[PDB]
Design an enzyme around this catalytic site. Structure first.
Site, PDB file in Angstrom:
ATOM      1  N   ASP A 216       0.685  -1.077   0.171  1.00  0.00           N
ATOM      2  CA  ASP A 216       0.067  -0.250  -0.075  1.00  0.00           C
ATOM      3  C   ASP A 216       0.790   1.246  -0.100  1.00  0.00           C
ATOM      4  OD1 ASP A 216      -1.522  -2.355   0.613  1.00  0.00           O
ATOM      5  OD2 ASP A 216      -2.725  -1.075   1.866  1.00  0.00           O
TER       6      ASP A 216
ATOM      7  N   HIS B   1      -1.097   4.344  -0.769  1.00  0.00           N
ATOM      8  CA  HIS B   1      -2.094   5.395  -0.195  1.00  0.00           C
ATOM      9  C   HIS B   1      -1.696   6.848  -0.463  1.00  0.00           C
ATOM     10  CE1 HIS B   1      -5.233   2.747   0.978  1.00  0.00           C
ATOM     11  NE2 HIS B   1      -4.368   1.823   1.740  1.00  0.00           N
TER      12      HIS B   1
ATOM     13  N   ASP C 273      -3.661  -0.215  -3.854  1.00  0.00           N
ATOM     14  CA  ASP C 273      -3.824   0.654  -2.682  1.00  0.00           C
ATOM     15  C   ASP C 273      -2.863   1.791  -3.093  1.00  0.00           C
ATOM     16  OD1 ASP C 273      -6.031  -0.621  -2.029  1.00  0.00           O
ATOM     17  OD2 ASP C 273      -5.310  -0.837   0.120  1.00  0.00           O
TER      18      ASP C 273
ATOM     19  N   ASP D 187      -6.115   7.425  -1.906  1.00  0.00           N
ATOM     20  CA  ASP D 187      -6.910   7.382  -0.810  1.00  0.00           C
ATOM     21  C   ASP D 187      -6.250   7.725   0.429  1.00  0.00           C
ATOM     22  OD1 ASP D 187      -9.417   7.278  -1.969  1.00  0.00           O
ATOM     23  OD2 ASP D 187      -9.618   4.962  -1.442  1.00  0.00           O
ATOM     24  N   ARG D 188      -6.425   8.304   1.639  1.00  0.00           N
ATOM     25  CA  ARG D 188      -5.815   8.368   2.833  1.00  0.00           C
ATOM     26  C   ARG D 188      -4.939   9.689   2.737  1.00  0.00           C
ATOM     27  NH1 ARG D 188      -9.516   6.535   6.224  1.00  0.00           N
ATOM     28  NH2 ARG D 188     -10.227   8.502   5.016  1.00  0.00           N
TER      29      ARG D 188
ATOM     30  N   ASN E 213      -8.019  -2.961  -2.961  1.00  0.00           N
ATOM     31  CA  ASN E 213      -9.674  -2.582  -2.727  1.00  0.00           C
ATOM     32  C   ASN E 213      -9.908  -1.333  -3.040  1.00  0.00           C
ATOM     33  OD1 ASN E 213      -8.265  -2.263  -0.293  1.00  0.00           O
ATOM     34  ND2 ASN E 213     -10.029  -2.120   0.798  1.00  0.00           N
ATOM     35  N   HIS E 214      -8.779  -0.134  -2.918  1.00  0.00           N
ATOM     36  CA  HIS E 214      -8.957   1.147  -3.159  1.00  0.00           C
ATOM     37  C   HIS E 214      -9.066   1.454  -4.583  1.00  0.00           C
ATOM     38  CE1 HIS E 214      -8.944   2.753   1.033  1.00  0.00           C
ATOM     39  NE2 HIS E 214      -8.575   1.382   1.284  1.00  0.00           N
TER      40      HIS E 214
ATOM     41  N   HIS F  55      -3.670  -8.716  -3.723  1.00  0.00           N
ATOM     42  CA  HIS F  55      -3.733  -7.434  -2.713  1.00  0.00           C
ATOM     43  C   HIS F  55      -4.365  -8.163  -1.144  1.00  0.00           C
ATOM     44  CE1 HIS F  55      -4.237  -3.464  -1.369  1.00  0.00           C
ATOM     45  NE2 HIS F  55      -5.447  -3.830  -0.661  1.00  0.00           N
TER      46      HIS F  55
ATOM     47  N   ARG G 271     -13.823  -6.496   8.608  1.00  0.00           N
ATOM     48  CA  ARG G 271     -14.060  -5.238   7.685  1.00  0.00           C
ATOM     49  C   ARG G 271     -15.611  -5.131   7.437  1.00  0.00           C
ATOM     50  NH1 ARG G 271      -8.998  -3.420   5.778  1.00  0.00           N
ATOM     51  NH2 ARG G 271      -7.288  -5.035   6.244  1.00  0.00           N
TER      52      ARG G 271
ATOM     53  N   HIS H 200      -2.657  -5.040   1.726  1.00  0.00           N
ATOM     54  CA  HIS H 200      -3.872  -4.670   2.333  1.00  0.00           C
ATOM     55  C   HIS H 200      -3.908  -4.066   4.077  1.00  0.00           C
ATOM     56  CE1 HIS H 200      -8.261  -4.696   2.229  1.00  0.00           C
ATOM     57  NE2 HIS H 200      -8.461  -5.776   2.661  1.00  0.00           N
TER      58      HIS H 200
END
Ligand SMILES: C=C1[C@@H](O)[C@@H]2O[C@]3(CC[C@H](/C=C/[C@@H](C)[C@@H]4CC(C)=C[C@@]5(O[C@H](C[C@@](C)(O)C(=O)O)CC[C@H]5O)O4)O3)CC[C@H]2O[C@@H]1[C@@H](O)C[C@H](C)[C@H]1O[C@@]2(CCCCO2)CC[C@H]1C
Ligand SMILES: [Mn+2]
Ligand SMILES: [Mn+2]
Length: 294
Positions: free
Chosen positions: A59, A61, A87, A90-91, A119-120, A168, A216, A243
């Protein structure tokens, strides 16, 4: 049409600048990175078969300067081959620079640079956790939708030297053969529960040997017995996924049959976690490069 060398040049031009400094590419250039990379992703298998030497990252991000540090420490393409596990957005504060540099390298070095879907890289997720907002502020929503169409074509897994299965999230109770993955059609959003959903969301769990409940709210957790059956059936030695945020950047699970990689130090600016990159030499020996939260 697209000037890839100029794009990369401008993106890398910020090496040394004060962290957080933006690189504002033209809308047409970003759209081009999406459309061109999309073409490349669709042209290659959804289940990649790669060979070491290779650098594997987890990740990111949107932590663009940390992505730069990774390349600084591992060697900028094409000095070293890379495989990211997803990923990318995001974030963080700079998902745009992050994803553009990655897509740019994919286009520039299609046979030595690879990116898996996390998943992002799903509209429903990056719509809520930052990417949409970043696009809305710096460009527009139409461009965000263009990214979504690109993400829907990303490959799902890779096998390194017939021994390391990379994805992932993790395993699925529906995953019986690799052919099931190869047969997954693209473009695809992830509308239903099942195999693809699990590959992007599942997590390993220490308390259960088989299948467990995932906090989750989606997919499942899997234990050491599940992993062992998987590795033996497909004659593999290790599962490499991301992940999950791990304190040291990397962490083994399921009695070392699995390793989780997270490459974004100080995630969300609220963790003191380190980031890590795993190097796989030509003798199939793994070493870890850690990025201290700087
Ligand atoms: C994202 C997530 C999950 O992963 C997350 O998992 C849990 C279990 C473990 C995990 C913990 C993560 C921490 C390390 C981070 C650290 C920081 C600083 C912030 C924070 O950040 C989390 C989100 C995110 C992104 O930052 C992430 O790290 O995961 C939420 C909790 C926050 O305290 O936790 O939290 C429970 C909450 C859950 O919440 C959402 C979840 O509701 C999403 C939901 C399942 C989705 O359902 C749909 C429909 C069904 C199919 C899938 O799509 C549509 C889109 C969306 C609504
Ligand atoms: Mn993830
Ligand atoms: Mn993540």
């Amino acid at each position: 049409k697209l000037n890839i060398d100029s794009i990369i040049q401008r993106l890398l031009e910020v090496r040394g600048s004060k962290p957080g400094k933006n690189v504002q590419l033209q809308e047409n250039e970003i759209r081009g990175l999406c459309l061109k990379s999309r073409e490349i992703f669709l042209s290659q298998p959804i289940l990649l078969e790669l060979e070491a030497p290779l650098k594997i990252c987890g990740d990111i991000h949107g932590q663009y300067y940390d992505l730069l540090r990774l390349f600084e420490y591992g060697g900028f393409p094409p000095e070293s081959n890379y495989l990211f596990l997803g990923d990318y957005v995001d974030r963080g504060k700079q998902s745009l620079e992050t994803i553009c540099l990655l897509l740019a390298y994919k286009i520039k070095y299609p046979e030595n640079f690879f990116l898996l879907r996390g998943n992002h890289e799903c509209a429903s997720i990056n719509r809520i956790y930052g990417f949409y907002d970043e696009c809305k502020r710096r460009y527009n929503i139409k461009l965000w939708k263009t990214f979504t169409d690109c993400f829907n074509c990303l490959p799902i897994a890779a096998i390194v030297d017939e021994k390391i299965f990379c994805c992932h999230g993790g395993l699925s109770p529906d995953l019986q053969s690799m052919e099931q993955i190869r047969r997954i059609m693209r473009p695809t959003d992830v509308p239903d529960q099942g195999l693809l959903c699990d590959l992007l969301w599942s997590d390993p769990d220490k308390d259960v040997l088989g299948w467990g409940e995932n906090d989750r709210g989606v997919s499942f957790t899997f234990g050491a017995e599940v992993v062992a059956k998987f590795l033996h059936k497909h004659d593999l030695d290790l599962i490499c996924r991301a992940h999950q945020v791990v304190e040291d950047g990397y962490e083994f699970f399921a009695k070392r049959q699995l390793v989780t990689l997270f490459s974004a130090p100080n995630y969300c600016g609220e963790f003191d976690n380190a980031g890590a990159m795993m190097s796989v030499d030509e003798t199939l020996m793994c070493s870890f490069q850690i990025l201290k939260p700087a």
